[PDB]
Amino acid sequence: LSSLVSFYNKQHVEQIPTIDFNEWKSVISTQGLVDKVKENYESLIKEQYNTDAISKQI
């Protein structure tokens, strides 16, 4: 029981770094790559967990 609690209650802090695509776009990059990564990267950042649905079933 204690393991599951510590497992679920483990805190995650790693200083999620910010990406400056403009910097990489300027210094050097493959044409269409820096932009393709940005648009695809941003798309997944929008997705997030649905805490509401889980809150109800439990």
Partner: peptide
């Protein structure tokens, strides 16, 4: 920015759980 989303979602689960207090009213009825 993810921390801002974390805190917002965090409070959501709290309010959703406290709603269980409404279920207690069902028993009284």
């Amino acid at each position: 920015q993810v921390a801002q989303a974390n805190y917002s979602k965090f409070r959501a689960d709290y309010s959703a759980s406290v709603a269980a207090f409404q279920q207690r009213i069902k028993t009284i009825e």
